[PDB]
């Protein structure tokens, strides 16, 4: 079978500038290659087809070329819209996607707007408290949360989940979630949620008391 | 408004079977090659298998040969694919799609939503839905807890609010069961004058769930 190697596998490219990606195939391939985008949460979008052809409505700071085994596209002038995995497919013989290149908008450095949620009465019911810290529109994407039951230093009890990047304005979101029995949480008064973050002076600390 | 709706996903063990379907509308199914590709958690696009406009070509990406068979009713502008000896590696999102106008031209570019396959010894389990009340930017959100398997939709009041919304990916809980949450940002001023709703739908479980999420 023929194998498509892309690269880079990861690229962050920040907006106004334009980023070059390479696909090669392990024989020739004639110019059957097309380009897709692929937003998180949607179809795939057929972007070039015949190595340098655009297809229907792309515009032209979508350029891609090459023949036999050695491919680019070019993406200029990238908006936040373009935040998305892109693939290159071989239809020489068959079908082959590469295994893709994920394109990052570099924005500004924002800091997280930070909220934490406490258990609703309805899930203690069930025996189970979940507190909820939410890290809103922040980049870059590495933060840090800390979980402080009574001033006690949390570990093991939480996981966290991280939205795909925002298409509009290119931040990221998180949530930690501190998951207790309802007995142990019934058994402590401060639920602290401790984050760290580059755009931040000093760690942001937000808390509440068990029942006010 | 050309369209491919992709059905037939759902759980099934390991080694068992499965059949897809896709429905075409809004052009000459029959003058159209179809595909199936896949997307395996964590992975890229994989094609999987193409029949071509008059069932004429049809070919199988490898790990799929001898397992997998495709085929089209033009009559009843459908494609089918059936999935026999199911492994886990064929837990994935599978799309339906054009490829080729006939012998003439590759096309591919009309693409289906997607359906999924879960291969899994597990049961099917709905969400507990809970809310994630709010206390100049107020934020407030839906908790859908204890689910399988993958995916989980929300919406807010309905599909009329999506500006502010972030809807974050599933988690794999120890206890081997989904749990998300879906956020949003609103006006203060608004808290008590605006309703907020979040629309959660299971459909492997026929769960729908319309949380109202108010001030404590
Ligand atoms: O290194 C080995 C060589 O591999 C490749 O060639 C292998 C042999 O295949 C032929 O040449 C290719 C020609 O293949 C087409 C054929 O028309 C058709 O018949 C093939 C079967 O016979 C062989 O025993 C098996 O390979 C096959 O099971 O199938 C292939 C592929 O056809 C589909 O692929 C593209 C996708 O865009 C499209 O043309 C066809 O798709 C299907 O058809 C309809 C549209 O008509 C679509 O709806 C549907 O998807 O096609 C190529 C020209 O581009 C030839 O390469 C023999 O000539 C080869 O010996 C190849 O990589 C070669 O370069 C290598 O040397």
């Known amino acids: 079978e023929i194998v498509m190697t892309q690269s880079p596998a990861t690229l962050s490219v920040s907006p106004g500038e334009r980023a070059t990606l390479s696909c090669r195939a392990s024989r020739s391939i004639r110019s059957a290659l097309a380009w897709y985008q692929h937003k998180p949460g949607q179809a795939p979008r057929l972007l070039i087809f015949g190595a340098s052809t655009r297809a229907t409505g792309i515009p032209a700071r979508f350029s891609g070329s090459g023949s036999g085994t050695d491919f680019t596209l070019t993406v200029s002038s990238i908006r936040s819209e373009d935040s998305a995995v892109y693939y290159c497919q071989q239809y020489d013989f068959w079908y082959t996607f590469g295994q893709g290149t994920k394109l990052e908008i570099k924005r500004t450095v924002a800091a997280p707007s930070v909220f934490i949620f406490p258990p609703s009465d309805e899930q203690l019911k069930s025996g189970t408290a979940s507190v909820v810290c939410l890290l809103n529109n922040f980049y870059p994407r590495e933060a840090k949360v800390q979980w402080k039951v009574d001033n006690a230093l949390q570990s093991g009890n939480s996981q966290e989940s991280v939205t795909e990047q925002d298409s509009k304005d290119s931040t990221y979101s998180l949530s930690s979630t501190l998951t207790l029995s309802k007995a142990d949480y019934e058994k402590h008064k401060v639920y602290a949620c401790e984050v760290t973050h580059q755009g931040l002076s000093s760690p942001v600390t937000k808390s509440f008391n068990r029942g006010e | 408004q050309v369209q491919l709706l992709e059905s037939g996903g759902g759980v099934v063990r390991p080694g068992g079977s499965l059949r897809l379907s896709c429905a075409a509308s809004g052009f000459n199914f029959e003058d159209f090659g179809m595909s199936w590709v896949r997307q395996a958690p964590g992975k890229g696009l994989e094609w999987v298998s193409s029949?071509?406009?008059?069932?004429?070509?049809?070919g199988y990406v490898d790990s799929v040969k001898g397992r997998f068979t495709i085929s089209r009713d033009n009559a009843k502008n459908s494609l089918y694919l059936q999935m026999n000896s199911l492994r886990a590696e064929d837990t994935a999102l599978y799309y339906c799609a054009i490829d080729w106008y006939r012998d003439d031209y590759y096309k591919m570019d009309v693409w289906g939503k997607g359906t999924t396959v879960t291969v899994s010894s597990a049961s099917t389990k709905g969400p507990s839905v809970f809310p994630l009340a709010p206390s100049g930017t107020a934020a407030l959100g839906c908790l859908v807890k204890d689910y399988f398997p993958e995916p989980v939709t929300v919406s807010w009041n309905s599909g009329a609010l999506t500006s502010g919304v972030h809807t974050f990916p599933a988690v794999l809980q120890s206890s081997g069961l989904y749990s998300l949450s879906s956020v949003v940002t609103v006006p203060s001023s608004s808290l008590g004058t605006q309703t907020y709703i979040c629309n959660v739908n299971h459909k492997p479980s026929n769960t729908k769930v319309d949380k109202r999420v108010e001030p404590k």
């Open positions: 029949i071509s406009w008059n069932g004429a070509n049809i």
